[PDB]
Amino acid sequence: EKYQTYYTTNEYQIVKEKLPDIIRDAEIKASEVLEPTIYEKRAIMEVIKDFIRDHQRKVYGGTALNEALKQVNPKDAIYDNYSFSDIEFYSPTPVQDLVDLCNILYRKGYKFVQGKDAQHEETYSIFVNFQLYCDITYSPTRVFYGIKTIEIDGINYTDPHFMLIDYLRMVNQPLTAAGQRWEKAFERMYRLLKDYPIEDFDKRLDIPEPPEEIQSYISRIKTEFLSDNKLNESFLISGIEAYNFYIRHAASSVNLNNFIANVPFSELISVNYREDVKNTYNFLRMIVEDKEKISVDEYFPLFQFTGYSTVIKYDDHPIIRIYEGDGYCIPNVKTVKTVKYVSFQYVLMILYINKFRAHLDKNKPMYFNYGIAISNLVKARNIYLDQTGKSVLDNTVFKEFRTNCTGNTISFTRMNRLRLLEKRKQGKQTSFVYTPEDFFKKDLETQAKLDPSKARFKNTSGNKIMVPKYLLFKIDNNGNIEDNIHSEEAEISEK
Amino acid sequence: EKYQTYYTTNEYQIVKEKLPDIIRDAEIKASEVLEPTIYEKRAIMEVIKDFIRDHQRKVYGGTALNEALKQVNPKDAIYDNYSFSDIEFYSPTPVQDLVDLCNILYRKGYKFVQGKDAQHEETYSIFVNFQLYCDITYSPTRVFYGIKTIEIDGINYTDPHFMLIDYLRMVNQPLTAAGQRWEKAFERMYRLLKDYPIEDFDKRLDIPEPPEEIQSYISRIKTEFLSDNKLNESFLISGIEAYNFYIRHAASSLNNFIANVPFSELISVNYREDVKNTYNFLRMIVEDKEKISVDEYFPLFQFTGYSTVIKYDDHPIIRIYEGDGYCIPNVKTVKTKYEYKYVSFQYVLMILYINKFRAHLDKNKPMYFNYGIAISNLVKARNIYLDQTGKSVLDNTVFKEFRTNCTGNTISFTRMNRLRLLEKRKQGKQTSFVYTPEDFFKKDLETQAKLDPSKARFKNTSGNKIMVPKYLLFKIDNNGNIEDNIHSEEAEISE
């Protein structure tokens, strides 16, 4: 039983070394002779880049980042001219844009030009000759025009400090996005925060201190409500409260506690919202001097950055704003006294999100405060690690890439396949396809049947829910709170 | 204006270092809490592993290589410390197996149990609770039982020296498979060829020397036919001719590895034209043309295309293989009459194994032993050459591996898949087949009776001589000449 040895030492090493270079050298050859070639690629991309310029849409994802990193330093590019990179962009009329770009590309000669309804969140896809070229994402009117942009070659590239939200959004989903995203999202976050650094503001935090009646209720929610172990299970401390937490923890070892801010109201995230809101309401309705002063404001999700929210107000004063974290496992910090705070990268995330809410809400003082808060929170973390000689991975309060989280989460695939099956049972139309070649082989009567204006999307405006049939909660005549048996409807593509 | 620096030197490095470990530590957490969890995975996996044992199917790929590597070393295993893998197995009745395993799993309680048409190499898919668990691949009866297996826990795992064919099949497709496969296929080829090395045979090559007339008809194909620059464009020299080429080249400053060439084995990247042309040349160069006979053969599973043997007095002169749609890595030579293309070193090492398997199916025991000797000798030859020259598998030698230089118009897998699907879509041969037992069992016994998995057609990939003329690619007209047969597609039934 004699045997031969194919591959040895260091022959195996020799192969592993040159192998990715050879694979590259081969992909180069493949791109210059296999259809679609690198030139067909370049051609379609410039056709789409022209359309974005024309309708003035907002480009995000890899394409915006690459373009932006390059405006600063071409060496900091995340793409090669061999990259078959997806050009993603935001649009308030996405299905109409899909039909236009699909027509334009078909007319230009290409095949097989196809416009599909993608798996992901209110995104549509354009494929040309079995190759995905771009993705059109629905952005509600309100959100859309509020997005800060940077201009390059007459194209609106989503502000680097806005794209940053989405990158933190990745690191802030440890169970559903650690494998598939944390490697690229860290690498990209690095270059983005290198070429577009976080600003340094010497300006003071000017958050108005509220009245004593309110000031006591905000405090008594922490001391009396959030202490009850059968009540605080699903709560996570966000807002200026959480901000101050990291601000205080930065003192533990030019220019002191001076970064501390007046807490204007509580901002909490619940991983069991409907139960936790009703419970906060009933607690305030018990601890409040004249219960008929209590009012409840609800808000739609802010784009794709938050879920629903509810503000409980006493004399039109916000006491607490509760956010819906249902379906998410939020990375959190543990201390817990004596005789749950959202993670450092989560607060750094919400601060940016809240700054954007302010911008949409037209609120200029809050828009300036969040910006100050971010700068201060970053100054705070840096000086702490400088004084302690620590790292973003050492078990500190400012630790990054946390796996430890609160809440029952579900993988993207699961979330996508379940949502699809729900709307499939509803008959809200599963997959939408547009093949201009096939569409134009059809009569003008059938061609007339297609209307992109008649397309519905989830209301993700961040706007106060006015109409009661869209409100999640109901206030009964006795003054109590109840789960509203409503219609979870949203909005048409008619702008 | 004055900015802050988030992430520095060597803070960026620090992150890149621990990051894949953290991602791993996170995937561990995700695997212990996200439905379906490993406590649902291993349940479904063991149900399928039981079915494979029952019907005695042949497991291949990653799962198979893993367990085989494991039976010799569990440290040299490919899938790591319960890294979720895909079940892939061969079956002569795959659609019936799909319906059985889909029923069994549904009855066992699970949802959503679904059996899809995978859209590949006559492969079918089983998903349970939005998670792909296994893939069933169609293997014709003839091929199926000829596959040498290794038994572990009453399950038939595909012989490592057979799986090797598929791994070489990957490195032998440089334009369509270099990016997506050459990294894993090399790593796996290494660990397979170390835990299951290539045998060492001291036995002599006993290939019978053919008649002086037959050898004369063979030689004149090389001189008078393959020299003509308007004829030899699509030809590639395979078989013992190519084998001998690498045997002679290993001995360049007892040359006993040389073999009698029993006949020419050629691969054409323009087969129908190149076959008719060989036939017509031989019909002119031959003494009495009525002694010329033509034997055709179906593709041998997924290892070859169609073949044609041109025989003079029932003696094989030349066997031509169909390489249409493939870009074969080669080594061009120039006798200066000039151009001669030999199939790459790893391509001959590949066909030798494929030919040894053909012999096994053809029951031919002397050829089954000769190919085995040839492989051993060809490997002995390459090793001793690199030992004498101090060279590597990547240096520009005749025995160079991972070649990019190839002959023939190829098309990317995606293109081949989407075009094949569109061709059968126009034919109405059914695009995507779905089985949802939950939905199927909500239906009446009359509709339930309509579903028959025995009535499923597959491409005839037996490697068998084409007997019936309506399945023959060529026709011999009364005048004695060759013609393209205007026949029907060879779709054998599952039964």
Author numbering:
A (entry chain A): 9 to 261, 275 to 360, 373 to 528
B (entry chain B): 9 to 261, 277 to 359, 369 to 527
The authors write:
The Mimivirus R341 and M. chilensis Mg561 genes were reliably predicted to encode PAPs after two iterations of PSI-BLAST. The Mimivirus R341 protein exhibits a unique acidic extension of 65 residues at its C-terminal end (D5) and an insertion of 12 amino acids in its third subdomain (D3). The canonical acidic residues D94-E96-D143 are properly positioned and ordered in the crystal structure as evidenced by the 2Fo-Fc electron density maps contoured at 1σ on the of M. chilensis and Mimivirus PAP active sites. To further characterize the molecular determinants of the dimerization of Mg561 and the role of the dimerization on the polyadenylation activity, we made deletion of the Mg561 (ΔD1 Mg561) and R341 (ΔD1 R341) N-terminal domains. Gel filtration experiments revealed that the mutants were monomeric and although they still co-purified with RNA, they were inactive, suggesting that the dimeric state and the N-terminal domain were required for the polyadenylation activity. No association was observed between Mg18 and R341 confirming the specificity of the interaction.
We verified that the Mimivirus and M. chilensis predicted PAPs were able to perform polyadenylation. These proteins were not only active, but also intrinsically self-processive, generating >700 nucleotides long polyA tails. To elucidate the molecular basis of this processivity we determined the Mimivirus and M. chilensis PAP crystallographic 3D structures, which revealed two topologically identical subdomains with a nucleotidyltransferase fold. Thus, while other PAPs form heterodimers with processivity factors, the Mimivirus and M. chilensis PAP become processive upon homodimerization.
